[PDB]
Amino acid sequence: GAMAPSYRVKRMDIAKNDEECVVNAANPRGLPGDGVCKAVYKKWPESFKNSATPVGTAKTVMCGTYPVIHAVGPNFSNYTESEGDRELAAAYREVAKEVTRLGVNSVAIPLLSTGVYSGGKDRLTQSLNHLFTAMDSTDADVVIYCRDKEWEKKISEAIQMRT
Ligand SMILES: O=C(c1ccccc1F)N1CCNCC1
Ligand SMILES: [Cl-]
Numbered sequence: 001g002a003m004a005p006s007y008r009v010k011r012m013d014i015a016k017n018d019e020e021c022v023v024n025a026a027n028p029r030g031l032p033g034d035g036v037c038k039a040v041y042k043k044w045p046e047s048f049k050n051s052a053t054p055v056g057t058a059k060t061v062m063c064g065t066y067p068v069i070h071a072v073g074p075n076f077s078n079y080t081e082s083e084g085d086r087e088l089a090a091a092y093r094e095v096a097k098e099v100t101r102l103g104v105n106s107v108a109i110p111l112l113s114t115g116v117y118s119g120g121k122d123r124l125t126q127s128l129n130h131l132f133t134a135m136d137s138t139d140a141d142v143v144i145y146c147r148d149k150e151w152e153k154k155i156s157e158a159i160q161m162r163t
């Protein structure tokens with residue numbers, strides 16, 4: 001575990017992360033996809049061998065010795081708000097199980113079901129709070145990656161609020 005487990009946020013490509021493993025905002029079919037998923041495919045394509053997994057689950061595939069945790073958040077275009085909320089919470093619980101199983105001291109993680117799976121809604125707070133609910137009992141250093149300056153500010157505020 002980390003000596004003093006922390007949350008941090010960085011605004012940059014998660015393919016350039018400085019952590020011991022990465023969480024992919026994956027699709028259920030293990031396809032290259034768009035956004036984070038496409039960046040992850042370009043950097044770690046070997047990790048997409050048998051990475052298909054259902055919504056609300058996470059499946060780890062090693063790229064060399066570097067673990068890629070493929071976490072499938074719901075696409076809110078297809079799910080009701082209630083069912084999507086449940087599957088988004090579940091995906092993050094599976095990420096915490098995998099991070100624990102792997103024995104890593106740090107993990108790079110995007111906010112699941114934002115961007116093209118958001119169903120056109122701002123889900124920063126919903127997605128971040130489900131991330132915290134799952135990861136707070138883990139002792140890995142968590143580094144959240146985002147692309148928007150205003151999201152960086154809001155994630156940073158949410159982290160600092162609870163310290
Ligand atoms: O997830 C969203 C989003 C999607 C649909 C509606 C509002 C939104 F803030 N982001 C905004 C652009 N940067 C990526 C994060
Ligand atoms: Cl970058």
Ligand SMILES: [Cl-]
Pocket residue numbers: 146147148151
């Ligand atoms: Cl973002």
